[PDB]
């Protein structure tokens, strides 16, 4: 038999565990016990960049990265993580199968040992705050926690905040003490991880779209026998429309229960927003060497 | 910028049992964008690998050849790699090269390369 | 340092697209971050029309044109791509390396600021179309997409199809919606735009043969430094070397390949066609004021 | 070669979520093709039913159709066994019998000797019981005029319930309920309220009896005469209206209830293992006329 | 039992500008389950369409060579199918067949033939 | 943690009257922990319990409708679990589902289960 | 009118489901609806040992086996079956022909109330692993499924394979969790099966040739009518001789669709495979008490 290994940043009771669960059940159940799949959440073997690089070398089975996060070794890759450049899920997903993705994806197979096997929804990141968010003005001298990574670093720069850099392990408590002022996530991971506890507001400011890729290790994937991997893939896309769905509902569900949770919830107006990334998205295209974002915005 | 230019210094004449530190000092695109590793090759033979540094320094890579003898280190505001080499001997003589990639690697060749040091370790 | 910009009309994944970042890599090694090269594909600056008045304004630094596409700017030089003049490309660098090739040159570089580093194998056009084209017979009441050359749509009048000139970023849809029955090219072109998705019939007629010359702005040229001319003129001699390779190999491979697409492949008589540009020699020599038709056929 | 004018048919009507998909079917496909495939709509019957139709697709003279899985058993007799009376549980389940090599035997029987070309096949559905009168249980289904469509599985529910069955087509359901000639009648969620039979009938018992796919059908001689461009398009876009179309039923499904009852529409939970009784004898029938078991097979995917 | 029988009757020498009746007895499988078909054969040759009739009777299918002169008809209660034949003339002169499919069909050979029944038509 | 799998045999054509033994066979994870049931199902209905067996053998639940007439058994050694039918009547006819559970439940479905065995009475 | 009941273990789609299929069509058609064949594929009834002890009972109308399964009731019977002393099927239905097969054939129908109707070929079994077998070697360590049949076993345990009796809708399942190394059967039937898609190597070992009677129960049999008789007799006829066509057909093409899916193709000496069922045979003569095995082989 073979049994596959996977991390994660996500914690136990997340919609990104409880698929890989779900996964790690059907991969045993549709190969009768041959494919067992070991899951590490809660960042236990490292952020998603230490477990991307355990993959390359071979050391790491299984992982979660969104398709922007290839930026990381694949410079073009990272404009679809630009803020507001995808409108929507379906549009990253369009971005994903077009044939800019299919070189980013063939790149990142050849070069860094990453068979992308499917992507799913995540959500879209909104942020949250101690202090209320009506405008972009509202951001100025704000303590703004962000992942490490530098569109959201952008987001919050380019929106007048304050980054902070910060591992997600660490942002519960940094919100509960009023170390930062403000993160920002996608909604189901509000809700999963209770940042709404430490949060009295939530600004719907829709700014990053985050896809989910499930990335295999090429060196692992390549010993697996062909009924392994058509079980594998199979698998894969079943769990993947359940966690696009789900990610989906919570979405459309949380803003009122945040409400229900005396969370002040603002609109604000985008348009200053995406104003202040243009300057951005030039400098990105001057950078690549050659103009991408004009292209990824009108797929 | 999208590349990374890199020069090495450091190639000196030394002695067996001998330390030498080399260093590498990077340009053009963002330092800690990439791993930095350290590579040797004498004539007519493959590079070998040395050593390796994560971007931030927290992970580190060495050949068994070379364990417990040589160092790796980075500094990402000089924007700089250093190879200390303690213990050596006349079969670390060999051009050294400095080399970038965005992720540590072993089935390629990294993507970016200065021209090398050469270190000379006489008997 | 010094950015240049350089357009083409070919999409990503093409020989001269793959060439061009070849180029730009080398640029940027072999100067040590010096020169680098922007790309601008897919002809979104304007065809190579557009292009080469960009380059004679200095607005634009590089770009891809044949020696007979210089014909816009110095007639004679359209005798050069008449069709079956040439036989192959040797036939054609001769005549680009002959004297009367160097007039032509040093017309380019007075007149009109372009300077014709050197120029690569870019394949010989065949026909594509949704009928079988067993011989020159079978061409009429062909719509049969031609660019935006003469000599191209001479070859099509003369073979007797109807020419529809369209640009190159439309033909496959053209094709797609049987809005055009043919279409022509090289077989390198052919696969990478793969107009044989299109396309049910591939006629081997060997009518023109492609040179790509790498143009660069005089008022760019003059403005860098000895070293920097050096690098670039070794920079592009090298990967024209490659790049001609690479279109005599898939120019060898190709007909196999389409094969094993379902493609039908007919080798028609070319006799025929050769026949039907007589009267075009004729008229050239004529209109130019000086025969010369006779001159490269015997070069 | 050239523009294509595709004819498609239906029964359901404007304003039901068959013709909304078909519509947006419609709406997909000139619009991917820059205008060379066009799709034509003939709602509301006025082509014929659904039998009829399908006979307009053998012949060459509609294009495109919709029909249930079960319903192919007019012509391949063994297919009916999907829409015996609740063989298949729910909508995965008639996939699985649909993608099955047994499916894949008849959906190739339909090819070869009838010209159906199955693309796709949606959830339309799983059929409830309007009435004028409270049905608790199936005792209530005794004496009881249940309008059925003419389709033998569809009267085999009523028969073995205990009604009496009537059969005609659907344009005349909402009259004759207006008009009482029949005390019921049997149709889906989204059915029920875009044919606003609720209207006029006071009860719906949720009996779950029979569970409706629904393919779209393309004329195998018309689909042999489209480019394979024109054929991926097409394939890329009844797939992508039919995930639309599948999830637009389930979201029904799931409030149109709270709906009815706000309509004053009494619905009753009767206990349906009594009408499970009933159909194992008519399952044992299946197997026995066809000459090879069949029934527990199917449920067994 | 799945399989239909077909029996024909009729056949007969008759004049031209004559009229004749041909029926066709079914038995086996349900009868309203099937499109009634006729077809007639001369020697060498395939066989000519002639027509059908739906399920109910409310759809009829003729060849041009016999339409305004033939009508089939169908009788659901006892299992049969008939062709009236009008103002025949000798083309008509063949073996007519009665068939039986699901479904009316252009494309193949329906699915279940009768025994054949002979029809003369004298000039 | 490690899961159960069950592969069924037995199933046959029998005779009313008739006595049949179904077997199950189980692999993944230990034998000896799990509550060991058999279910039934017919085309149309649902799920029907049949008999289940505790870890040691020493409790055995069984269904009324089978009371007197069917024995459940298992064999921890050869990690098998058995369901001996007799005095078996047309109204037996079913697939017989092996199923494994921690412990015997009634409000949901055994975790694991085979893939079924057909038993087939006669009349 | 009559119903009969045919069972098989074979599945749709298998050349021997295919022929009972067209039997059940003939029957119906050459009777005009008097003899209709319900058909129970599968395994559904049980195994051959059981549907023939079915038939021994009245409770089974028609079934398959092949001459060598009579060995259960008939043990000299068994003797064709012995692994390679049926050279091929015209020296097995030499056997089935000889006056020691009619003597098989009269206690067949006299003792177990079995009418062989007709014998028709179903091929010769081969061998294959998830493991190369080159040699008879490469089989020690294999854990090589076999029916439960004892001349299968025997060819199993005497190549050096471990043995595994498993019945015929396992197997797939079987192979694909690596429970099993190998089977072995005829090519028709691993294409029907799939198994080739769950194992990557076939070893054409020729080791056992496969008839398949078409055995009715005789108390059916006597119930018949003559014309009944001779119309099922001819059918069985019809069906058989094509059956046998099929059969041979696909053995010639069917390694080349093998190889075409990727399957290693191993021709192993089989000289030592036939050396090691030497003592066998003098085992079977001495538990006979007669001498048979060379009597056969000799036929
Ligand atoms: C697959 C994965 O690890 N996603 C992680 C993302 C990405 O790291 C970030 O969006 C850059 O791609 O950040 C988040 C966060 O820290 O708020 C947690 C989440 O687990
Ligand atoms: C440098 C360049 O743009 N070459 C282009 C040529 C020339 O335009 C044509 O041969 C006239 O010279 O045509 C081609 C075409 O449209 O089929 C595409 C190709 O990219
Ligand atoms: C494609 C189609 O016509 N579906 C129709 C179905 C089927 O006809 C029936 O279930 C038998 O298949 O019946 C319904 C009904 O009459 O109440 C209306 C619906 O439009
Ligand atoms: C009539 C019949 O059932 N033949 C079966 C044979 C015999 O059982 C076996 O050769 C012993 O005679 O085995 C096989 C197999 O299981 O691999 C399947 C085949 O269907």
């Given at each position: 038999a073979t049994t596959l290994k996977m991390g994660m940043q996500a914690s136990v009771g997340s919609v990104e565990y409880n698929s890989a669960k779900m996964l790690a059940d059907t991969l045993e159940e549709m190969s009768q016990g041959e494919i067992k799949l070991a899951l590490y959440p809660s960042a236990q073997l490292g952020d998603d960049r230490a477990m991307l690089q355990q993959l390359t070398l071979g050391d790491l089975d299984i992982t979660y990265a969104e398709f922007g996060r290839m930026g990381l070794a694949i410079?073009?890759?990272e404009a679809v993580m630009?803020?507001?450049?995808?409108?929507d899920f379906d549009h990253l997903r369009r971005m994903f199968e077009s044939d800019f993705g299919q070189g980013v994806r063939d790149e990142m197979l050849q070069?860094?040992?990453?068979?992308?096997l499917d992507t799913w929804y995540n959500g879209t990141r909104e942020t949250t705050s101690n202090?209320?968010?009506?405008?972009?003005?509202?951001?100025?001298g704000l303590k703004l926690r962000v992942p490490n990574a530098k569109q959201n670093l952008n987001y919050a720069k380019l929106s007048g905040a304050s980054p902070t850099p910060m591992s997600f392990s660490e942002v519960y408590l940094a919100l509960q003490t009023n170390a930062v002022d403000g993160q920002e996530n996608p909604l189901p991971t509000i809700k999963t991880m209770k940042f709404y506890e430490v949060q009295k507001n939530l600004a719907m400011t829709h700014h990053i779209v985050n896809d989910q890729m499930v990335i295999i290790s090429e060196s692992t994937w390549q010993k697996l026998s062909d009924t392994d991997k058509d079980i594998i893939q199979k698998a894969v896309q079943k769990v993947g429309d359940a966690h696009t769905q789900t990610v989906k509902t919570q979405e459309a569900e949380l803003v009122s229960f945040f409400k229900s949770e005396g969370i002040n919830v603002t609109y604000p107006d985008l348009e200053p927003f995406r104003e202040a990334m243009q300057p951005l998205y030039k400098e990105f295209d001057s950078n690549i060497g050659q103009p991408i974002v004009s292209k990824l915005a009108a797929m | 910028g999208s590349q990374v230019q890199l020069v090495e210094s450091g190639g000196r004449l030394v002695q067996t049992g001998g330390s030498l530190r080399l260093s590498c000092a990077a340009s053009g695109?963002?330092?800690?964008?990439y791993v930095m590793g350290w590579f040797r090759q004498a004539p007519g033979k493959e590079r070998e690998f040395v050593a390796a540094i994560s971007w931030t320094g927290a992970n580190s890579y060495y050949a068994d050849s070379v364990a417990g003898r040589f160092t790796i280190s980075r500094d990402n505001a000089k924007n700089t790699v250093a190879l200390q080499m303690n213990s050596?001997?006349?079969?670390?003589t060999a051009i050294y090269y400095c080399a970038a990639d965005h992720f540590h690697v072993t089935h390629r060749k990294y993507d970016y390369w200065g021209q090398g040091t050469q270190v000379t370790v006489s008997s």
């Open positions: 410079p073009r890759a630009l803020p507001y450049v995808a409108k070069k860094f040992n990453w068979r992308a202090r209320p968010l009506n405008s972009i003005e509202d951001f100025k | 695109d963002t330092f800690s964008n050596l001997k006349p079969e670390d």
